[PDB]
Every structure is written in structure tokens, then in C-alpha cells.
Assembly symmetry: D7
Homo-oligomer: 93 residues x 14
């Protein structure tokens, strides 16, 4: 296990496609152990969701394009993890 | 485990059927490891519950329809997990 | 394991009988592994309690009848876990 | 693993006997695997402490009496677990 | 195990001896597994510390002899555990 | 066995570019770095504050400080360090 | 393991030497399994770190003479743990 | 003023009468300035409300007559103020 | 001022009419000093608002027949205030 | 405006007499501008409530006695304000 | 006396441009707007979420919704509205 | 107003004399408007209290001597307000 | 009073000039009732501060340039207020 | 009021002089409405206090020097207010 192993991003999203679509679909890409989508805010034209993605050697620009193939839009990359083992954020002042 | 593996959704519901009822019935569905339902807020007409359903390649359309047919009505999908392993949501400012 | 594996309900009850009785009893019902009763509040005349019951294929009606025959009533069913495996509640916005 | 396997009682005792006396004593009671006594609050005349007790088919009446024998006095019973397993309490709104 | 397995007490104490000593010292007492000492509040004359001390069957009075012996003063015993198994306080209203 | 620096957590200022999964891939492959983690602190218009949690074996704070800067980064403060045989977590207190 | 296995102290210090130094150099110390230094508060003059050090039969005096050598100043010993076992502080009212 | 100027009580109560009535009604009682009623928890059979009622010299029993009179049931009086001036509870350990 | 001076209810509602409508139209209502509508939760179907309405001798039935006219549905009456004076809820254990 | 102008005492009383009795009674005591009694906690045998009292050169011994006369019992004194002004307590680490 | 809409709180998506004190000045001078307040929610790379609290007399939600959009804004949701004679604040509850 | 207008200090003290005495007394000192004593904690042997004193040009030494002559010692001076006008503490990161 | 009345921005800042400089200086500009600078984070080359500025018809690009005239740098405009009267943010979900 | 009107700073200090001392002395300085000092953390050598000083056109250099000369040492300036009116900090994510 190497490279990007965990990606977390917040996207904006026309209400369609429905979000179990996105999950099902993001499963397929290059070595994805699994995806987590949680609903952030739920506005009227639109939808804020937090996508958590994790696997081996992940393809960033693949995800990033795969997502837009769905009329969905990355607002920001919240967190990235890379390397042999899965490091979490440590808190502090 | 593949495709959809855990689904979290909040549904509005008439007081009947009761909630254990739903729970029992949802244990049935195609590849359903198990179901949790906690009681959100219990207005006079009606009853908001939370639905936590996990399993292997769960069928979304199966579920929604199982709930409607039941009296329930789906307000949102709060969260989904799709893939080989359970990715929990990683939290961040 | 199948069906009703966890049941949590809040019931009003008179000071009688002493709570260890209801526990000591509801232990004995069909398919109950354990029972937990925590004290909620205690008013002059009466008494609120939460009642967690876990087991295999607990029959929802035995249980409730049991509590009634002891002189307390089910104000509400707060949570229910059903299926093969203990699904816990996933928290979300 | 049957009957009362955990009893938390809140009780008022005169200062004396000191708090690890009870601990000592109550441990030597039938079925009793263990005893925790934390100090709740302490007033001029008197001392409010909580008595968590764990074991196996515990005697509610021995205990009740045992505590009273040392000049203690049961203000209330705040928890009970009964059965083959320790069911902790599930929380909900 | 047997007797007291845990005793927690809050004590007042001059600045000296510095508290790593109290730790060391009490560690060497009869039947002591380990001893934790966190610093509560640091006053100008004195010092206020929590001593958690645990192990197999503890001599409460030895423990009280030893502390006083370094210029301690036992304000209160906050918690005591005894018996065969390490029961913790359970949370409750 | 591990020795030396084993985890480091630094806060840095960062030109929007390069994007952040750059850093993560990049840093990932340093000397004896089992894993890096970057969470995003604050995404200002001019710049962008981000937090790097780096972890490995006998780690070279100077290979790291230099690599970041190359990418145009800037260490503001180092917030945590764990050195030695075992991973020790911070304990809390009054 | 015996005597002190964990020591937590709050210290003040010049900006140099930078903190990953202080970390390196106490791994060096006698019987020190590892050290954790989180940054408490960074001022203009100076710089407040917390130092959590863990090992076997640690030497308080080596540790402390060493910190003064590095220019630092030990404000307080916030917690100490001693004996065979990592007793954590049990929290109470 | 004189006598009771404030009484707060928690009551259980069937769904009907809807609670704007209780408010209205109690407003018209002897010496009543105003009356606040917030909704605690909404159970299936019943309903749990807090009634804050205030004014000049209140007839406690009239207040208890009037509530019962609509199918109320007084679980407890939570707070009472009397005298010339409106003293509130002061916070303290 | 007399009878109800403040009423707070939680309601569910279609997205239309948009919420500044609902606001306008209850200012219209009889004896209504003003209304506050904050948005509780926005779903795909529907839309949960809280409605805080304040005035003199307000008419619960006008208010409520009016909300149903606008397509809405009143889930619960969360708080009511009645009499000459805006008694707020005094909070207690 | 001299001497004791506020006394908060925490006290255990048998259920009877009910709580607005004391309120009534204590108000008719010398110097006494007002009396708040909130309910602290309530057990099977007994009832713990807090008595905040406000006035002017208050008699500690009248009160102490007065409370005792009704079968009440002072567990402790939690606040005192004395002088020409009500000084509330300032908080600090 | 005031009538009609008197306070409105809306959340909008916003191209980084125009900058935010634009909006504030601009909106300030609408029909019967005693004051506007904009706090910044989240400053993403592509866009930017911001919150407008607008307040005045018999306010025209449609003059407002239109003005925002002109500046390239986009209402996502209206979060609060106060209409009528007096300013009523939300009361809280279980 | 000039000089020492507010003084807050935490002092240890024996159960004697009863706290209203220390208030009743410290009221009488030179330049004291009001005095507030809240109960901090109460141990078997002794007693912690916070002591807010407000006045004009309070002499710091009279006050302290006063408390000593009553048999409690000043553990620390938590806060002091000096000058013409009551400056309150401004909170900051 | 019209236009911008309140501006709040977070800037980055070489440690010089000192921050009482910035305050003193920002006072002068076109109609500034007053400025508030609080210290955010305090890094080693650098300094995060939150500037709050308030007056009549404020000159944005004046401030914005005035600030940089000091080797200081706007990272983001956090909040702006405009018009006849001073509107604060209202909170909500 | 003009120029500097309120200054908030945290300073490290030897135990002597005491803190009221400082307070008194700082009431003196050029145009000083009044001073607050609360006690932050009281390490063994030393004493972190917070300094809140407000007034009219306060002279910064005067102050720092008044504190140093006193034994104290300035770690940071946490906050300042300069202008015609006291702008408090307005808080935001
Ligand atoms: Ca974002
Ligand atoms: Ca930490
Ligand atoms: Ca409701
Ligand atoms: Ca929802
Ligand atoms: Ca994180
Ligand atoms: Ca009650
Ligand atoms: Ca979550
Ligand atoms: Ca007490
Ligand atoms: Ca739960
Ligand atoms: Ca102290
Ligand atoms: Ca519990
Ligand atoms: Ca930093
Ligand atoms: Ca701890
Ligand atoms: Ca505990
Ligand atoms: Ca319920
Ligand atoms: Ca208090
Ligand atoms: Ca209260
Ligand atoms: Ca109790
Ligand atoms: Ca304070
Ligand atoms: Ca929204
Ligand atoms: Ca309320
Ligand atoms: Ca104590
Ligand atoms: Ca502040
Ligand atoms: Ca920013
Ligand atoms: Ca609100
Ligand atoms: Ca310290
Ligand atoms: Ca500082
Ligand atoms: Ca704000």
C-alpha cells in the first residue's frame, strides 16, 4: 500500500444524481477500498456533501474528473493521506 | 462486501406501524446484515425516525419502496458507505 | 441471531415494585440475554425509567405485556435493533 | 450469570465508618465480584456517595440490609443490570 | 485479587517533596501495582494533588501512614474499589 | 525498532499551488516516512493554511523542512513532535 | 518496569533550540521509551511546551538537569505515574 | 407583592386539551401576571410540560385545582418563589 | 394584553410557498405584533421551520387554520405564553 | 442594607410539608425580602432542595431554626452575600 | 411603525468577485433597508459561501433576490425571516 | 473610587466558624461595599471557599489579617480590580 | 451614519510593527469610531490578528492599502456591515 | 477617548511583588481609567497573570516599562482598543 490512501473533499451537487449513485460509482475507480458520503447542508437548487475516499495508490485527477462527469463540483480538498500506513490528524492548540 | 454496504436515512412516519415492526421487516431485504432505528422527535401526528441499515450490496430502490409501502416517507439520505470496507466519515473544520 | 435483538423504551411506573424486580423479572422473558434499567427521574407519585433490553428474537409483545402486568406504561420506543448483527446509530448533521 | 449482575445505588451515610470500610465489607457479600464507591458530595453532618456493585445473582435484600447495618441509608436505585450479559444503557434524544 | 484494588484520594501538601517522589515511594508499598498522581491546582504555600493508587489488596492505613509521613494531609478519599474485579463508576442522573 | 523523530506535526502557509495531494504524494516518499497526513486548516483568498502530520522512522526534520519550502511552503510553527522507540500520545491535565 | 514510567511536565523555553531538538535529546535519556512534546503557547520572547515522557525507572534528576542545560525552565510537574503499571487518573467530581 | 410570586411545576397530561388552552385558562386565575408553558417531551399516550406561572400572591391549591381540572397530573413542583421580591436561584457547587 | 401573547410551533411544509411568504401572511393575522420564522431543516420533499409568533389575545385557531391553508402542517406547539406578561421559562434540573 | 443580604443553603427535607409551604413561611421571617426554593433532587424517603434567601440583616439563627422546625435539615451553606451591595461571585481558573 | 419584511437572513454562493464590501454598500442602499450585515461562511477555491442579514422596513424580498443575482450571487436558502410591526427573536426549546 | 476596589481570593479554612460569620465580619472592614463568599468544596477536616470582596480603597492587609485571625489561610489571589472604574476581564485566545 | 460602518478582517503580519501601532494608526483614517485588534495565532516569522474596525462611511481600499503600508497582509474579509444602523449576525442551523 | 483606550496583555511574573501591588501601581499611569488582573496559572517559580488596562490615550511604552521595572515580563499583547469608542471583538468562524 503506497501513495494517496485517503482523500476527503467537499463537493456541491445538483440534487440529481442521487447520492447512493455517487457512492456506488466511486467504488469502481482504481483500487478503492471504500467511499463514505455524508450529507452536509441540503439547499434548494443544490447539495453540499462530504466525500471520504480510501484505497491504494489513488488517482486524484481521475476522481476529480469522475466526479464532474456527474455535474458535481469540488469546492475544496479537505484532507489527504499518503504512504505506507494510515496516519490520522493529531489535535493540539 | 461491494457496492452499497451501509445507508443512513431519516424518514417521517405516521405513528403506525410501530417502530419495532419496521425494524423486523427491514431485516428481510436483499443482503441486509442488520438495521438500527432510533426515535428522533415524536410530533403529534407523526414520527421522525432515523434509519441505519447496513449489509452487502444493498439495493436502494428496494429499500425506499419497502419504507413507503410501509407508511413511511423519506426526507433525506443522511449518509452512505459503498465499497470493500466501512469508511467512517473523517471530520475536519 | 434474527429479528428483535435490542429494544430501548422509556416507561412511566409507580414507585412499586422496586426497580430490581422489573429487571430480575424481564431477565426471564423469551430470548433475553441481558436487561438494563437506568433511573430517569423520580417524581412524588411515580417514576420514569429507561429500559434497555437485548436478546435474540425478543417478542415485542411479551415484553410490553410483562411491563404492563407490573403497572408501568410504555411512553415510547426510543430505539430498536433488528437483524443478524448489532447495528449502532450513526451520527450525522 | 443470572439475576442481578449490577446495582448502582445512591446513598447517604454518616461520615463514619470511612468509605473503604463499606468497600471491604460489601465485597465479602454473596455473589459480589466487585464494588466501586465514589464520593458524591459531602456536607457538615453527612456524606452522599454512590455504590456501584457488580457480581452474580446479587441479593438486593442482603445489600439493602448490609448498608443499613453500617448506619447507611438508600436514597434511591439508579441502575440495574440483570441477565447473562452486561447491557450498558443506550442513549437517545 | 482481594480487598481494596483501587483508592483515590485528594490531598493537600507542601511544595516539597516534589511529587515524583510521592509516586516512587508509594509504588513500593505492600501490594501496589502502580500509582498515578495528577496535579489539581498549584497554590502559593501548598499543593493539591489527586492520587490514584491500585493493585492487589491494599492496606488503607499503610497508605494513610505513608502519605502523612511526607507531610501530606488527606482531605478526602474520592473513590474506592474492592473485590475480585475492577468495577468503575457508571454514569447516571 | 524506531529511533529518533517518529511523528511531527507542523503548520504551514501555502500558495494555493501546488494543490495539496501534491505535497502528500511528494512528502510520502521521503526517507523513512511510513505515512503523511495533511488536513486543510483555512483556505484564504491569498494563501491557505494547512496542517501536516508526518510520521516514520529516524526522520530528518531538515529533509522535511526543505522539501516543503521547495514546493513554495512555509513552516509557521511545529506543533507536535514524538521521538524515540515508542509512539507516546500527549496526556491531558488541569 | 519500576519507579516512574510516565512524567508530564509544563515548561517554558527560548525558541531555540527548536522543539524537535528537545525531543531527540530526551530519547537519548536513561530508560526513556519515548517522549511527546506538544506546543502549548507560542509567545514572542519564549514558548510553552508540554512534555510527556515515558519509560522505565526514569530519572527525574537527569531529565530535569537536562532541560535546564538546554536553556529551558520547568514550570510544573503536571502528572506522574509510578510502579509496574500505567495507572491513568480516574476522573470524579 | 406578597406570598408566592412564582411556581414552576412539571406535569404529565393527555394530548388534549391542546396546551394554548392551559395557558389561557390559568392566565385568568386569581392574582396571575402571566403564564409560560414549554413542551418537555412528547410521548405517544400523553405529554410532559413545564408550567411557569407568576404574579401577585398565588393560591397554590387553586393552581393545583385548576390543573388537575383539565386532566393534568402534577409530577413535581420544581421551583417556588415567595416574598416581596423575585429572587432567582444562584449557581454553585 | 391578554390570553396568548407568544406562541412557538414547529411545522412541516412544501418548499412553496417560500418562507418570507408565510411570514408576511401571519403579520396579517389578528392581534399579531410580529412573527419570526427560522429554518430548522431543509429536506428534498419538504422543509422544517420554527414559527415564533407574538402579539395580543392571539387566536390559536385563526393561526392554525391559516397554516393549513398555506399547505403547511403543525407538528407541535413547543411553547406558549399567556397573560399580561412575557414570562420566560425558568430553567432547572 | 447591612449584614447578611443573601444566603443560599442546601437542605434535605422529608417530602412533607410541600415546597411552597416553606416558601410562604420563610418569607414571613424578619428582614426577608424574598425566597427562592428550587428542587434539587428527590429520593424515595426524602427530598433535597436549595434555599436561596434574600433580604436585609438576615438572621442566620432564626432561619436555621425555622427550617429545622419544619423537619428540615441544613446539609450546608453554599453562598453568603453581606454588606451594602449584592456582590456576585467572579469566576477565574 | 414598521410593517412587512423587517429582517431576512439568506445564505448565498458567490463568485470571489465582486468582493464582499461591494454587496454590503450596494444592498445597503435599497428601498428601506436600515442596515445589512454580511459574515463570511467558508471561503472555497472555486466559490465562497457568505451570509447576508438584511433588515429594514416593508422590504422587498424580490428587489433583494434580484440585486444579489445581478452581482453574480445565488441564494441557496433563506434561513430566517421576521415580518410585522415588531422585531421578534427566535425562542429556543427542547 | 481609587485603588483596590475588587479582591477575589480562595482560602482554606476549618469548618469553624460557620461561613456567614466571615461574611458578617469582612463586611465591617474599611471601605468594603459588599462581600461574597461562595462555597468551593468541603472536605472532612476543612473547607475551601472563594471570597469576592468589593469596596473603595480596600487595604489589602487588613483584609488578609482579618481572615487569618479567623483561622483560614489565603491559598491565592485570583483577581484584583484597581482604579476608578470596574474593569472586567476580557477573554481572548 | 451610512455605507460601511463595520469591517472585520484577518491579517498576517511580520511581528513588527508591534500591534498597538496598527490600532493607534487605524484610528486616524476617514471617520473611524474605533478599532479592535485581538491576537489570533502567534507563529515565529509571523502573526495572525483579527482587526475589527468601525465608523461612518468607511473607505475600504484606504484601509486595505493603509494596512499594507505596514508590511501587513489581508488574508480574508470576515464580516462587513453597511447602512443606517448596526446589524449583527443572527445565528441559526 | 482617543488613541489607545484598552490593552490586554499576559505577562509572566515572579511571585513578588504580589498581584494587588501591581494593580495599585498601574492605576497611576498616564490617563488610566482602571486595571483588572486575573491569575492565569500559578507555576512553582513564577506566575502567569492577565493584564486588562483601560483608559484614555494610554501610553504603551510607559506601561511595558512600568511592568518590567516591577519584576514582570511581557509575553504577548493579546488585545488592544484604539479610538473614540470601545469596539469589542466580533466573533466569526
Ligand atoms: Ca470547504
Ligand atoms: Ca495533542
Ligand atoms: Ca416536535
Ligand atoms: Ca433531514
Ligand atoms: Ca481531522
Ligand atoms: Ca419531576
Ligand atoms: Ca458523522
Ligand atoms: Ca452540600
Ligand atoms: Ca443513540
Ligand atoms: Ca488557588
Ligand atoms: Ca448511563
Ligand atoms: Ca501556529
Ligand atoms: Ca488526566
Ligand atoms: Ca467516574
Ligand atoms: Ca418519550
Ligand atoms: Ca456561582
Ligand atoms: Ca435555575
Ligand atoms: Ca437520588
Ligand atoms: Ca474571570
Ligand atoms: Ca443552507
Ligand atoms: Ca426556553
Ligand atoms: Ca475533597
Ligand atoms: Ca475576545
Ligand atoms: Ca481567514
Ligand atoms: Ca436563531
Ligand atoms: Ca503550571
Ligand atoms: Ca500568550
Ligand atoms: Ca458573527
Amino acid at each position: 500500500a503506497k501513495g494517496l490512501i485517503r482523500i476527503v473533499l467537499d463537493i456541491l451537487k445538483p440534487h440529481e444524481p442521487i447520492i447512493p449513485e455517487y457512492a456506488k460509482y466511486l467504488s469502481e475507480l482504481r483500487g478503492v477500498e471504500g467511499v463514505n458520503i455524508t450529507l452536509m447542508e441540503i439547499d434548494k437548487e443544490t447539495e453540499n456533501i462530504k466525500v471520504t475516499i480510501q484505497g491504494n495508490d489513488l488517482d486524484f485527477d481521475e476522481i476529480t474528473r469522475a466526479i464532474e462527469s456527474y455535474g458535481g463540483s469540488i469546492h475544496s480538498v479537505d484532507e489527504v493521506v499518503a504512504g505506507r500506513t494510515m496516519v490520522e490528524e493529531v489535535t493540539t492548540p
